Design a protein around this nucleic acid. Structure first.
Ligand SMILES: Nc1ncnc2c1ncn2[C@@H]1O[C@H](COP(=O)(O)OP(=O)(O)OP(=O)(O)O)[C@@H](O)[C@H]1O
Ligand SMILES: Nc1ncnc2c1ncn2[C@@H]1O[C@H](COP(=O)(O)OP(=O)(O)OP(=O)(O)O)[C@@H](O)[C@H]1O
Ligand SMILES: [Mg+2]
Lengths: 762, 791
DNA sequence: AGCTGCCAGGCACCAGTG
DNA sequence: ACTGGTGCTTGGCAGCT
């Protein structure tokens, strides 16, 4: 079997599936990696059943592996960043291709969603912004230049693809990009003067094209992302705020789990994009708020109708690629059938943005009518066997079908005729591939078959025969069906030619429907969850009245205690003191989440919110735990990131810095960090701490005040109160907890004596 | 909902529903000819779990019956999927003969496949024990029992409290856990796999005693050392009933039960076990564990045994000296013994299948292969001067007769199953050989008939063949078929060929199949007979496999000791630990650079060490290697050090600092309530409160209690410099630290333990190393000099 | 070597004579 | 009450290409 080997040499860096009967089999290393990735026997050879290959392809692709199929020649390849088949994608997750490269001036980065055609480029200012973008976009497949210096950024990621340096040449990029978009220059996309980014996108587009060997007419635009356009959040922050993913890798108990009740998969994905990239331009935000408010009373009637639109976005991709299947057209039709109802319901809404979405949504009455006449109500999965084109659409087809039915009705009458004649009740006509049509009689009656019957196949308990009057009509049936089938196929490909001219307007429509779904959803969440519209002020500041954690309040069956916050250039840092279980962390995270939601355009969980501009959010809240430096090391590294990068427009949340080292070292560090944040950086800061010594800071510097949480001892337990009050904590509860936990009474008494001794010299 | 009373059901469903009523909560594979079928909700569930098609069976009266099923010859693949998901499955077979049965043939559930009850090679993992366990509790404590169905090993214990019980669950890691319906502490078992709620009556003491005595063939349990332990007996009683219920045959390999007493082993709490990464690393994997380094056994039963020793260190001085002696004596015979031991394989699990009467042909083959290694092992070991080695050499036995039997009765390389014959070799039984002669006359005859008839008729396409559906035949092409003799009886028609039969061929066929059936039945009768001949020696055979496995462990431990440069530890009368040049057995293998060996001196005068040093300076490692060295000494193994003198240890406790604080405090409370002068306590950065000093205050109070009242051997790593003052105040406490060097803007970690407290805490240096701006560090150093001037 | 479809062996179900 | 045909799972492989 040197055929497999020599054929593997073609794509050596890609897993090779080799058709062997009703299975695909991998050999050698390929068998290895495959077994430990899919959990199957490493009998070296491994394999998977032909009827489940798409399942295993989805898994491999999900783990960043490209896969070449073979049936003997490489007839198909799938790469993680360029798949478009529904079976291989996850409904509610974006699947991106990206390219990264480094210049002497900085980084170049680009991403592509091969289904929607959403194409973005950027030029991250440094290793830190780059890391945040990599984490935010989370590409399924990453193209990188060989000479990539700072490999620490991408090493460890799945789907890494090393590419030759010549693939990142700008002259070639501009040309290829201009040709793809059909323009002479890129000025209209606002990227004409962004070479690094362009080099990344040029490489990406070429890879995509090579992977598809098809035109990509749905990729008609590209957009540049600027640092100042969005609130910046690093991986740790992004992780610690649990936006779309909890700290345990799951999806429950995240912000998305409470905010994302969209009715469409494209809506869901778009909402997740918004959550991860809050915008800083209040014009956009004011527009989103207005819409949220205007849509309120229309939510109930709009959602069930929007639900029927489905994932038009991804279907449209298969239309552009010419791989759409009968039920894709059926769903597109069904989606077109909702447009007039959506138009009529949106007509009354007093909102310029809603009216624009309403126009952008379109109608497509012609395409609607076409698919109504061309395809049957509930077509099969594939066109392969026909039965997709409805009767009455084409005259020829209608005829061939009438002949086949006629020849079929004859053979049915032939059966009843041959029965009464021969008088053999077991007699019937059946069809098969090997023998085509045939006549069957049971064994016990077979000896009475007419002499003109020719014997073709004996079964355990029956004989099958043929006669000329049989093979005659078999031809009438087979030749007819065959033509009908060929016709259906041609009529089906014709549907593509009639639909594709409107591709651009169809893409705008799906885009609009996706945005409506997002906005209608946020309108329903605000009204349902008692949110309020925040207002924007000129200078940095946050004023919350009765704010809540939007996730914790929906999960716990205990009353959530709402809390105020007042931060301004005059009251810039709060030293938060008190218990562990008291509510410090929650209180800090809800501040960040409220800021985030305000900068997505959504209403927020409070009675009132006034908030200034915010360039970035830092949350050093929660835990260390790495392969893993050490808790204190990590905690200090994240602190260093905040002190090097925060500005006066930053929101900073710090959670008991100092734990994990000596008392004096830890106290000295916390004091110094807090002083630098307050007097030099001047960022709006929530500084949680266990050090009572830090509560003297407000008497040493302006812009710093003490707030705290307290507890209540009652019965045989402790009730950690969750109300933030002014001033410093005056109690500690560590000994009380130790007593409840069963620490022997003698030890507690000795610890009490030691505590007072320690706290007094202070 | 149609009213589904008995009489409204067909005879099939009356029989089925009645059987299903005996296994209401588990899947029932129902034998229906060539398929095992499931119905109603079982069909829907099976459809989902096995990815098979959900169909239906029509009904004259009522709703159609949801149906699913698989070919009987493919059950083992489907059982695998089920058992790997924790599903039990009852296997119902046809008992009667349909030909002589009026209505439905008699059916019976002959076995229940469950996660902790499997014995088939295809369902188990070679190097992992698969245990069935049963648990229960009353007001004073817990009853617990375990059984390895593939070895007969039956154990009972009575964990005194919750942590002990939790530690035991973790140590034994049962694949199936039976628990009494009134269990109060569900937190102990809530998350486990194969959890099985059981009725209270299955834990009745009188019934347990009666059933255990019946199973062991005794009048009382005095001889097994468990007459005294009714709380454990209740659990074993539940367990044995479950085991008999799942196998539904005798279990002659379960001939004994042993009690595991506290005093007999070093009791390790859960945090200790998970923090020393004995067989599972902290990330749940098998990489870089104690076992990954020490387990180079060559037999699967040996690998299992070694992991059992690692988790259960023994406190019997005698056992320990004997193991050491063996390890020292055999050190030179390693290379010669291992290749031969490897060939004995997993005789333990094969013997279980023998006992269960499920052993397949290749099990007897491997058993035979194992018997053929004994003479060489006997020879290799006679020289080795060591009483314990000769005791093992004897226990191992030889079984010459049994070896010869299997050599005479089974072919060199038999097939996977007995079902289709070809297992019993020729010369073993004359009747069998005779019946086979007929079945093997096949091709001289068949070819002879073909030629003869081809020449006589002159039809060159003529051929003789066989078909399972239609039988033997003479084939002539459609073209020349019209020229066949009129004597030829038409049997089967094909598209381009015609098949016929003649009396001669029919007659040959009628005897080739009856004799084939005769041969196959005799083969199966003689295969069963092998069991009857082997079983009487089951007891001596189990002793043999047990000795073979212990030999594999000790031979392996001897090779590790030599290869990894270990030394033999000695034991002292009083609690204490004296290590010269000690290393962490795992860390020193993974780490790509020399490991810095360190000493340790613990005694009743020097019983608590306060350990300081910078982050990443080696604190946790130093503590962990102390525990591992102790652990390794108490399995009878040599140790990673230049020298080690160690006293008695009853328990090892661990507390690794980092809701929480509620758990940290609960656990430290457990330590203070249960540690003794013979305990080894490892406190890693404990004491964490809500303010500056409450946590430190508690760690201080805790340390004082450990030093002054309990007097246990304690290693107390901390970053609280305040605690370096303890030695001044308390007898028995001393300072040690991990050395670090600060040269300009860098910090080097020496990794070596020195006496006294560290010169300084390196928090600020470590923070500067983490990238914290120099301006901040400069402010912090200023703040620090204010604080340092208070005293 | 690559598709199709008969068969395996339980029991019940049904239409056609008693 | 008989007789003789139908159906239903999935794996194996005859029978045709
Ligand atoms: N405002 C609130 N109302 C009701 N419950 C709350 C509130 N805040 C917090 N909780 C509950 O209290 C629990 C503990 O809160 P949290 O982790 O924030 O305490 P903390 O010890 O003050 O934080 P840290 O010490 O980590 O800075 C949370 O799990 C949450 O369920
Ligand atoms: N004796 C030793 N020889 C060589 N390397 C060592 C030694 N002890 C520890 N190391 C290495 O140094 C690292 C840090 O050790 P350890 O985790 O015990 O430090 P630590 O003092 O517990 O502080 P932290 O908890 O901050 O890591 C370990 O990963 C280990 O690889
Ligand atoms: Mg440590």
């Amino acid at each position: 079997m040197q055929q497999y080997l020599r054929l593997k040499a073609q794509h050596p860096e890609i897993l090779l599936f080799y058709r062997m009967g009703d299975f695909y089999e991998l050999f050698y290393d390929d068998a290895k990696r495959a077994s430990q990735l899919l959990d199957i026997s490493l009998t070296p050879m491994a394999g998977i059943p032909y009827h489940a290959v798409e399942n295993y392809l989805a898994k491999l692709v999900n783990q960043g592996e490209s896969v070449a199929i073979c049936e003997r020649k490489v007839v198909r390849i799938v790469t993680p960043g360029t798949i478009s088949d529904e079976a291989l994608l996850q409904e509610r997750q974006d699947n991106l291709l990206a390219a990264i490269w480094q210049d002497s001036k900085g980084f170049g980065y680009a991403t592509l969603d091969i289904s929607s055609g959403r194409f973005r480029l950027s030029e991250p200012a440094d290793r830190e912004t780059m890391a945040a973008e990599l984490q935010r976009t989370n590409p399924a497949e990453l193209l990188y230049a060989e000479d990539f210096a700072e490999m620490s950024l991408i090493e460890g990621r799945r789907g890494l693809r090393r590419r030759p340096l010549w693939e990142f040449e700008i002259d070639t990029a501009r040309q290829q990009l201009n040709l793809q978009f059909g323009t002479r220059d890129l000025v209209g996309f606002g990227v004409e003067n962004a070479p690094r980014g362009l080099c990344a996108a040029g490489c990406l587009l070429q890879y995509a094209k090579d992977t598809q060997r098809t035109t990509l007419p749905h990729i008609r635009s590209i957009t540049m992302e600027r640092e100042q356009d969005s609130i910046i959040m690093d991986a740790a922050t992004r992780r610690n705020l649990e936006i779309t993913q909890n700290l345990a890798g799951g999806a429950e108990n995240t912000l998305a789990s409470v905010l994302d009740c969209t009715v469409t998969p494209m809506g869901s994905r778009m909402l997740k994009r918004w959550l991860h990239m809050p915008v800083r331009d209040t014009r956009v935000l004011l527009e989103r708020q207005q819409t949220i408010g205007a849509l309120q009373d229309f939510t109930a009637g709009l959602q069930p109708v929007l639900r029927q639109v489905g994932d038009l976005e991804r279907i449209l991709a298969r239309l552009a690629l010419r791989t759409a299947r009968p039920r894709d057209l059926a769903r597109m039709r069904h989606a077109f059938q909702q447009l007039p109802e959506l138009r009529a319901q949106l007509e009354t809404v007093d909102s310029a943005p809603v009216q624009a979405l309403r126009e952008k949504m379109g109608e497509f009455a012609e395409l609607r009518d076409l698919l109504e006449r061309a395809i049957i109500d509930t077509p099969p999965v594939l066109v392969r066997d026909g039965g997709v084109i409805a009767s009455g659409y084409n005259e020829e087809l209608d005829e061939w079908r009438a002949l086949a039915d006629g020849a079929t009705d004859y053979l049915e009458r032939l059966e009843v005729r041959e029965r009464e004649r021969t008088g053999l009740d077991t007699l019937k006509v059946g069809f098969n591939a090997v023998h085509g049509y045939y006549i069957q009689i049971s064994r016990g009656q077979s000896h009475l078959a007419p002499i003109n019957y020719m014997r073709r196949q004996t079964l355990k308990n029956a004989e099958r025969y043929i006669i000329p009057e049989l093979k005659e009509y078999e031809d009438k049936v087979l030749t007819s069906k065959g033509k009908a089938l060929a016709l259906e196929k041609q009529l089906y490909e014709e549907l593509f030619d009639l639909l594709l001219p409107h591709l651009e307007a169809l893409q705008q429509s799906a885009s609009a429907l996706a945005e409506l779904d997002v906005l209608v959803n946020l309108a329903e969440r605000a009204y349902t969850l008692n949110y309020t519209c925040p207002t924007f002020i000129d200078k940095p500041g946050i004023r919350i009245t009765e704010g809540r954690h939007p996730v914790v309040e929906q999960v716990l069956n205990e009353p959530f205690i709402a809390n105020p916050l007042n931060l301004s250039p005059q009251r810039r840092m709060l030293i938060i003191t008190g218990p562990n279980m008291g509510g410090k962390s929650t209180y800090m995270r809800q501040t960040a989440l409220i800021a985030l939601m305000a900068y997505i355009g959504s209403y927020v969980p409070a009675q009132k919110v006034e908030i200034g501009p915010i360039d970035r959010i830092f949350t050093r809240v929660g835990a260390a735990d790495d392969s893993g430096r050490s808790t204190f090391m990590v905690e200090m590294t994240e602190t260093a990131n905040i002190l090097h990068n925060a500005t006066e427009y930053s929101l900073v949340l710090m959670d008991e810095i100092g734990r994990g080292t000596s008392t004096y070292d830890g106290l000295s560090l916390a004091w110094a960090c807090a002083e630098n944040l307050a007097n030099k950086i001047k960022a709006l800061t929530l500084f949680a701490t266990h050090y009572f010594e830090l509560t003297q800071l407000p008497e040493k510097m302006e812009g710093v005040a003490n707030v705290h949480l307290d507890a209540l001892e009652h019965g045989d337990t402790i009730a950690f109160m969750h109300s933030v009050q002014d001033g410093a904590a005056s109690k500690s509860y560590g000994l009380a907890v130790a007593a409840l936990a069963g620490v022997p009474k003698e030890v507690i008494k000795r610890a009490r004596q030691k505590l007072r001794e320690l706290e007094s010299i202070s």
